[PDB]
């Protein structure tokens, strides 16, 4: 539970070698509405494969 001899800022870096946020670059474009949602999701205006699905 304790540290006896403080690790350098070197090894503090290499522990942070894998924290990097996964990119969500894979956007989609609508079939018959042309707008952009996230893939397998709905827009801000209720479109999903060219349908007013939620009408909100």
């Amino acid at each position: 539970a304790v540290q006896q001899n403080k690790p350098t800022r070197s090894k503090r870096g290499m522990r942070r070698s894998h924290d990097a946020l996964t990119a969500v670059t894979s956007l989609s474009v609508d079939k018959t509405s042309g707008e952009k949602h996230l893939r397998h999701h709905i827009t801000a205006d209720g479109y999903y494969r060219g349908r007013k699905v939620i009408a909100k």
Binding site: R16, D19, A20, L21, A23, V24, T25, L27, K36, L38
Partner: protein, 110 residues
């Protein structure tokens, strides 16, 4: 022509804003707005509210061009601390320091 926008004293820590403002290093703006609109975090609330304020400083003060407009440098740097006192058990306290951070967004056409 070059322009810079800064949010000073953003109420978080440096590694919390370093992680999403690592992806938008070396990007164009419209792919950066689209990688920050759908990153599910709090720093993506922070700097995406400021990264759009940087392009405002282009279209208004510097180069109105936004289509082919790059982001050159972005580096979140530390700020002050709100050193409150946290109570730990058995009578002893604990000097908490609520962290605070500064972010620059630098926008130009290299």
């Amino acid at each position: 022509m070059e322009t810079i926008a800064k949010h000073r004293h953003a109420r978080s820590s440096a590694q919390k804003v370093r992680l999403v403002a690592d992806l938008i290093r070396g990007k164009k703006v419209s792919q950066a707005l689209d990688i920050l609109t759908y990153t599910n975090k709090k720093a993506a609330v922070l700097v995406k509210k400021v990264l759009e304020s940087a392009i405002a400083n282009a279209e208004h003060n510097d180069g109105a061009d936004i289509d082919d407009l790059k982001v050159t440098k972005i580096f979140v740097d530390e700020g002050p601390s709100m050193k409150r006192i946290m109570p730990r058990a058995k009578g002893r306290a604990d000097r908490i320091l609520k962290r605070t951070s500064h972010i620059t967004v630098v926008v130009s056409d290299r």
